[PDB]
């Protein structure tokens, strides 16, 4: 533990550089408004006194236009149907919710969407009947490559007519992949008598067609699903109403914050203008990076909070929402606390069956590489995704190696006799800053692309090495102190 005045100076410098970089980005946005407008069309609305909105973010624009038309009404329908089923027929709630999910998927994706989901589920089940984990994973990978096939893309774009329904179908099938993979692997591993009646085709269909997580929702474990779907004990509708009220208030606050950021600063258009990235200043560059990561954080708060609220109304325990990215300081912490459901899926079904940290450093290398390669191929398998995956694999490996080297008894006693706990905390903060810079660069390659990545690398670490790099590392050192001091409350 550091003295409180030291910790306060660190937190003060952290908030200072955050807000000054945001102000610089706002200035540059206001200054290049008409050029950015004639290049990318900016939306108008009276929500913020007349400022124009940057609507270049594909995911935000896509999910907002789908939700304002269909998804919010279908989710309200699921809520009321679930409550009526809990009130009238508590034992038939899973099948009632399955029928509602099938009808909603039909209503929003036509007959081909339901047909494709049913086909994938049926094939996965019929292959899981062999009870071979290798064969199950092979079937899942082939079903996932069927999405990456160009001729299949052509046939599906021919199926639909508005070109957003095709993307909705692609995302739905991509998530269904993980869902039926989890089901089939648990079925392959089942050995317990009382668990024999859980892996039936009706249960698989009820798991796959659970509307709160049908299109984009996080990965819910089948164990938790079938545990909650057989409880028979309701949860005090009077308290459900208050849960709903507080969830709606919090979700509206998050949505308003995201819209405020998108109205104030044109981070996405600026990232789309590489000649402008090359000319903006370093404060604006770092502010663009912070704005990107925080907008992604708030966007996924919103995208995951609606399924989480619906699950909490249904009585389930959903995976935890992401921790604020302004408290992450390491690859390991980032990838353990950002996407909890997917992290748990990976740990359970990719990491351990290949062999995790229990079979040596080479086994750890192989398992971590397998996990990140699968994550890249599932996110889409573009070159920038493979680059992001390689950088994150390298970061995780280096952090594991350094931690294992430090936690040896010899070196640990050497440090414990040479340096004070304060000095050890400060050395850990310096290393955490040196790791946080690369974490940010890798995730900027994820968010912007390879050209944005090389621009940031060249302008921060090559062209401005002697002093820009040192300033960035000092700010990240203060930020790392703050994050490490906060991490004790939950680690």
């Amino acid at each position, epitope marked *: 533990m550091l003295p409180r005045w030291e910790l306060a100076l660190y937190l003060l410098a952290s908030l200072g550089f955050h807000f000054y970089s945001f102000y610089e980005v706002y200035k540059v946005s206001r200054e290049h408004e008409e050029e950015l407008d004639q290049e990318f069309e900016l939306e108008t609305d009276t929500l913020f006194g007349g400022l124009k909105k940057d609507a270049t973010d594909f995911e935000w624009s896509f999910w907002m236009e789908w939700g304002k038309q269909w998804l919010v009404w279908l989710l309200l329908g699921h809520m009321v149907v679930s409550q009526m089923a809990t009130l009238l027929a508590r034992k038939h709630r899973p099948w009632i919710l399955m029928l509602y999910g099938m009808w909603a998927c039909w209503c929003v994706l036509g007959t081909p969407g339901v047909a494709m989901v049913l086909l994938h589920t049926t094939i996965s089940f019929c292959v899981a009947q062999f009870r071979s984990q290798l064969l199950t994973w092979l079937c899942s990978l082939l079903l996932l490559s069927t999405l990456r096939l160009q001729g299949v893309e052509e046939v599906k774009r021919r199926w639909y007519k508005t070109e957003n329904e095709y993307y909705l179908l692609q995302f739905t099938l991509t998530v269904r992949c993980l869902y039926y993979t989890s089901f089939s692997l648990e079925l*392959c*591993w*089942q*050995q*317990l*008598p*009382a668990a*024999s*009646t859980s892996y039936s085709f009706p249960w698989m269909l009820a798991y796959v067609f659970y509307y709160p997580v049908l299109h984009n929702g996080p990965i819910l474990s089948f164990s938790e699903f079938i*545990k909650q779907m*057989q409880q028979q004990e309701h949860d005090s509708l009077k308290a459900s109403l208050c849960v709903l009220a507080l969830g709606l208030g919090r979700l509206l606050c998050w949505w308003w914050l995201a819209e405020l950021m998108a109205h104030l600063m044109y981070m996405h258009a600026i990232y789309s203008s590489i000649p402008l990235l090359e000319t903006v200043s370093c404060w604006t560059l770092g502010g663009l990076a912070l704005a990107q990561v925080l907008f992604f954080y708030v966007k996924y708060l919103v995208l995951f909070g609606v399924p989480a609220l619906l699950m909490r109304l249904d009585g389930l325990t959903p995976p935890a929402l992401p921790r604020c990215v302004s408290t992450m300081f390491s690859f390991t912490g980032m990838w353990r606390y950002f996407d909890v459901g997917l992290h748990n899926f990976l740990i359970r079904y990719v990491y*351990i*069956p290949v062999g995790g940290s229990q079979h040596g450093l080479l086994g750890t290398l192989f398992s971590t590489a397998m996990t990140f390669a699968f994550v890249s191929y599932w996110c889409g398998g573009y070159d920038y995704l493979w680059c992001w995956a390689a950088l994150n694999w390298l970061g995780v490996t280096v952090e594991n190696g350094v931690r294992r080297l430090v936690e040896t008894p010899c070196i640990q006693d050497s440090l414990a006799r040479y340096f004070s706990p304060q000095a050890r905390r400060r050395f850990h903060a310096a290393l955490a800053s040196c790791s946080t810079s690369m974490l940010i660069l890798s995730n900027l390659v994820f968010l912007g692309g390879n050209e944005v990545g090389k621009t940031y690398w060249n302008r921060i670490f090559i062209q401005g090495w002697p002093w820009v790099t040192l300033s960035v590392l000092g700010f990240l050192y203060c930020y790392s102190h703050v994050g490490i001091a906060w991490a004790q409350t939950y680690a």
Partner: antibody
Amino acid sequence: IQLVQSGPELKKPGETVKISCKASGYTFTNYGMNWVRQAPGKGLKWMGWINTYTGEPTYADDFKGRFAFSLETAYLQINNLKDEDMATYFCARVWNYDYYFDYWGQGTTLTVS
Amino acid sequence: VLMTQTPLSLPVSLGDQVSISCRSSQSIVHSNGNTYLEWYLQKPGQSPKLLIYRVSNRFSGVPDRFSGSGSGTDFTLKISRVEAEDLGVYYCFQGSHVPWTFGGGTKLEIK
């Protein structure tokens, strides 16, 4: 289908113990394996089981922290650091559905003094 | 879950009807909707052997004189004709609530 255990063990209260159970006549990895203990002045008591396909053990709360199950996939081992527990340890196979213990081992007697 | 057996030990003559009672502390009904309560017979100096596996069911090699009835919290094992190979210790066992617990054991003897 038969399960055969290691044999009698005479050891002092401080040593550890490793008992083995070899199964023949079926696909070892298709079914789980349970451990039961029978003290002289007590009845049967379930200690825990271990998934044979994935190697994941689960112990009862009472027998936690000291005992450990392990695989050699077609043998299965139990390990512990001792106390005044002179029970007889049985090895049992669990079935896929509708009933638990269809086949048992012969039993391994443990003496501490 | 605590399972109590009655009686603790009973003498029987060759060719009598025998009824052993096993009472749980709570309901042995599982979330699946069926209760996993089963009966084991252990002869002196060897391993237990399953006789009844679900309430009123019967294991493969078991004879046809081991009918076992049972309610949701009270269960009974019945031996029609004690054929001199049914002597030993009888345990009831529940597999519905973790951890799984055996009964106290009932000892048949000859008068």
